[model samples]
Target chain A: SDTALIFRLAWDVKKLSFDYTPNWGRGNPNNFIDTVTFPKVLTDKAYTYRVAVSGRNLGVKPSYAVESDGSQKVNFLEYNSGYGIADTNTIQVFVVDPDTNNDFIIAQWN
Target chain B: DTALIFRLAWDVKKLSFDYTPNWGRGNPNNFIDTVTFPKVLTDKAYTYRVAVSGRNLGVKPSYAVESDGSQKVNFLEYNSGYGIADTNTIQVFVVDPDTNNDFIIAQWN
Candidate 1:
């Protein structure tokens, strides 16, 4: 039997975050558990963030920098404050098809 | 093949727009070809325009107007100022998919 071949692509992340929750469908997480904590080392300062991906089919490199598809850049931002207390941060992972440039959002923690 | 199975999703209308012509791949044309014009009998004066931009560059928009329904159809009929003598004006057409919604664009003169 001959079968039609179709290729569908998808992506996922372990963590992501924002000062406030983002629109879930637009790549925001519904819950804060997936959010990344501000780095305790730098307090009261604005910091930019980029997502990292881990998986096969990434091609050439296992991790790559995240950039906007159209009209927007800087997927998300955070403020880092060093206050002697331990703080953790999570970064949202986004994947884009090299061919179509379609994007997906996922969460990651560190 | 004795038997076959397939699943597909269908909808009444599916429209896609790309900033770059030719779907962003291959040789792209300077002008766009997919949009329709504003409705002929618009109750209020309406404006039309086109926006052009590169991936990271700034966007530039241009605007034009057609007073009424008669002017709209005739504008399309006269090629909307896109006749041979005009370089800046391009022939355009109007389409009304349903009530109240329309899109206009330039076409071959």
Candidate 2:
């Protein structure tokens, strides 16, 4: 029996820098995932990226199965209909972490 | 002059039959932005994952993909969160105006 979670997320922009601590998602069921909205990333500037995770019951190499603590996400995709282009920037909605046995759990961030 | 800059990014390159993506800068130009895989017509069970992120909090990102390249959608996720998904993934279809093709820009989870 192991769920001692190990997750990591770090982003570096030509304009900014972010670690997983700031984007820690949900509460009981999620971490290493966050809700993101920008100005966090300069759309005009493409940043170099990196992400990693390793849990107690690790799987293989990449995607070290971070079992859910309290992520109750269902499937609902949204489309923004507003002042176009003016509302565009580098976007990262939800990154996925396939649970043990590989559950399609979507992690939504801002 | 609203040419309507709609982009439909779709990919199964993460898993579907070991499709390797080339997200390079120049040269042949089959960069990361494009997934070079078997055209979606086979009976393969694509891993299938989906997400939509956007500017302004009040809007929702949505799109439909038809196998005949007949899917559509308004702007959704600005970046659309990145995910780690295997392929067997499937979404919609369209004679899409965006991406100018049926390949919808979806997050791979």
Candidate 3:
């Protein structure tokens, strides 16, 4: 349903959602959702992205930003021990296609 | 070389994890003892539990190295913790098959 792009996050991800779908199992880390193509807002080519989690409560911010566009996709997720004591923080994200939606085929955390 | 083949082997092996019974959290700069992939990577599947050991501001990664009687592991750090100090360079983790060892790839901004 590529009416527009629909990037969705269920909650404050202190953790990671690899191929992370809505209710992916704990044992099975989701596959890295790599590239997606769409008309208009989307492009035929592959886009790059990175994942990082940070909250005032999320002690030490965590990130995997250095991954090459292609390398970002994987069944991998990592976080540090101490989370910020605050309730609010964010996952540092950089979607190179970078924005918008309609036809929604969200590439999982890459 | 079948280095690509080895990488291929490592790829699909990540459908699952066998670390913490719950959320995968542990001491920074430490290694997870044993990990089992959802499937089997001898045929193929990736599995391992690693915590953040370093972060962006000059924080370099610590490979699964053994210092004392304990085993250290290859790990990337979370930015929120005081794991690894970020020296402004990015810390990347890679398992080298040629050596079957772990190392960090540092990137300068």
Candidate 4:
């Protein structure tokens, strides 16, 4: 018999002028997923990018399992609304192990 | 306006899980003109894989985008509680650059 463990992940955004609040539906203990926004305010042009996810557990080390890459550019009309703000975001989740110190993964944006 | 500016780029995953709640609403909307999700999970690791609506818009660039050039090592943990534990589990999103057909760009396991 094996231990039926439940895992979840999510993201949280903290405002420099205010407290940190989890993005909608992303604060759950079991929702460690990533999302993207585009036509980025950084530039008024159009471009594409990608996001990837990989992880490892007790007997297993970190490895790439899934990738969300080559996405279209973000729209420009929506960026003019506001720009230049430092927001703190997080990816939260619950894995099988309670040993938080040894259980960690990395997410990269390329 | 004739200059070939690299333009602004973003990680699709960030739009759905990072800044904005939806794809087309406000400031963060700049990153996504439009998008979609898996209505039902089919694969063992992704029983809830969904497709994008305007994926065709991404084809031209994707086809032209250079591959990593080689297949890198992708290690998997058999009993880490992250693999496909259930056939009905849905954790991946099959992104199709073309909306006219069913294609895939990414998935979660």
Best by lDDT: 3
Per-prediction TM-score to the true structure, in the order listed: 0.21, 0.14, 0.17, 0.14
For model 1, residues A1-110, the per-residue Cα lDDT tens digits are 01010001000111111222122222233333322322111111222333542321222211212223211132222211211112233434443333444433423333
iRMS, model 2 (angstroms)? 17.5
Q: Pick the candidate with the highest TM-score.
A: 1
Instruction: Tell me the spans in candidate 4 whose CA falls farther than 4 Å from its real position.
Output: A1-30, A37-40, A55-110, B1-109
User: DockQ, in order, for the candidates?
Assistant: 0.01, 0.01, 0.02, 0.02
At residue B49, candidate 1 shows an lDDT of 31
Instruction: Give me the displacement of residue A44 in model 1, in angstroms.
Output: 42
> Which window of 10 residues has the lowest lDDT sum in candidate 3 chain A?
A1-10
* lDDT per model vs. reference: 0.25, 0.22, 0.26, 0.21
Better of 3 and 4 by TM-score: 3
Between prediction 2 and prediction 4, which has the larger DockQ? 4
- Per-residue CA lDDT of candidate 3, range A1-110, in tens? 10000001101111121331222112222232222221111122244433344522222221233243313322213332322212132333333332231122232222
Model 2, A5-109: lDDT tens digits are 000000011011212212322222343222222212212212222221221111222222222431122111112221111112222332322222222212212
Which residues of candidate 2, in runs, are more than 4 Å off? A1-110, B1-92, B103-109
For all candidates, what are the clash counts? 21, 54, 52, 41
